[PDB]
Symmetry: C3
Subunit: 214 residues, 3 copies
């Protein structure tokens, strides 16, 4: 569910046309967020800390409309009503993962419990990229994707680039939560299309994620 954007109106007409013919219209950024609050809440509730920051990220993307803009399969700029989550869930100790979809819910408890059921249902073996190729086959780009590396603190991860117009959707990476000057912080990297998102929206995204994580 989405709107075809009237390019002639739309405040980013000129921003988007600037990057239209770029070899690489994407930018990657890594920043750090405090997350001590969500870690305490997760520990106390006996819950997955992963789902707490997954929610934080998914909610910020939904709440800042610039993060809902996509170049659809037919090459048209569209704005999705709602953005869901793809994430590569590790299934084996040698790194095997299976990518799967998590629906956004505005109520954390609802999101949390649907998330948990999805993870419990994850197949023992599987095609690591089936879920992504399904969304591409469907033409559903109303998604973001986050990959966790909970045992690695990084200062930079850049994204891959599928095609000239850029990836179909935003790609994110979460890293290890670590005490820095007495506060728990974790790194989050992302790759976005610069036609849709400037520094200013990235600032609000990270501010927003950190607010949820506390």
């Amino acid at each position: 569910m989405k709107q075809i954007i009237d390019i002639e109106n739309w405040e980013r007409k000129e921003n988007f046309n600037f990057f239209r013919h770029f070899q690489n219209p994407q930018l990657s950024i890594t920043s750090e967020v405090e997350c001590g609050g969500a870690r305490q809440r997760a520990k106390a509730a006996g819950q997955s800390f992963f789902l707490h920051y997954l929610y934080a990220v998914l909610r910020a993307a939904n709440e800042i409309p610039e993060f809902r803009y996509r170049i659809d399969p037919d090459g048209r700029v569209v704005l999705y009503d709602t953005i869901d989550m793809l994430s590569p869930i590790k299934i084996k100790e040698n790194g095997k993962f299976f990518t799967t979809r998590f629906p956004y819910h505005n109520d954390f408890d609802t999101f949390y419990q649907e998330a948990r059921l999805i993870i419990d249902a994850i197949p023992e073996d599987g095609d690591p990229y089936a879920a992504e190729n399904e969304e591409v086959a469907d033409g559903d780009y109303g998604l973001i994707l986050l990959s966790a590396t909970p045992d690695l603190y990084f200062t930079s991860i850049t994204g891959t680039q599928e095609k000239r117009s850029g990836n179909n959707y935003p790609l994110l990476n979460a890293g290890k939560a670590i005490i820095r000057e007495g506060r728990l912080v974790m790194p989050i990297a992302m790759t976005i299309h610069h036609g849709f998102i400037d520094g200013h929206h990235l600032s609000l995204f990270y501010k927003k994620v950190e607010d949820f994580l506390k």
Copy 2:
């Protein structure tokens, strides 16, 4: 144009091989992010009732002017050119141009007046004063790379007791090695710390 500039004699150019190495790369650019101490400049700008932004804008612009490698470009015909002097573009958003002056106070004065209102002899810095980051990697317009360096400045932050800010840049690797990057950041920090 109407810019000072020199067409480079490739055959007597000290970076002939360095540049030729990269010439058919799909992506000949590197991105680097580092951070610089900036407490001295924060304090000087506070004392003078001045824009902190223009202090670090100038620090960056001066460093690039003092390291020749930061002033090499590929003109519209694909020829290597050296610019004697480099000005600053910055989205204030409206992208505005700031001429370089050897003299901070002159630079500052002219920049304030400008704000109140194939030339590749430029760098562009984009500021996001509310966003700290450990990395930004920039766009790439065309195969041969962007027309000029693209920089990003982020939030000044107290890290182990010292005010530091991140500066990312994307440059063409044929012009610039790790040695020049190191001199660049060192010069920006010397002006700011």
Copy 3:
């Protein structure tokens, strides 16, 4: 040849769908930077009058050798090859080859002698020990990516009482996931202490 190497049977390979996902991409590579503690190695190198450079160079080469994913290459004909063993290139600039040995002291000895003087079974590390950085993203030679992993080592710096240093790298996502990157950095840090 005469390398111990294997032409991978993609249809029966555990990474078939991983590799096939990335292999047609405009950019199938990813860049990562992370910091590793290295106080122990700095100390041990000091105590033994050794090159510290060679300690971390070794830690990196050893980590890549021990994780098979870091040894997969795309040969000149576009075929996936797995090298049993991998050596090190490093600009010393003379880009010089350092053969891997399982034993550190042996590697050290040979490396010191070497300095005093379509093969993709290699990684290349470029050290800039006076350059502090939080991020470097590398270049890309062709659509299919670089021929082998490119790395950058930066300045050793104290963070909250621990000596740490940044190591950046560019890899093919067809061969290497976050899981393997996490293991790579863990092994490097385990050696450097």
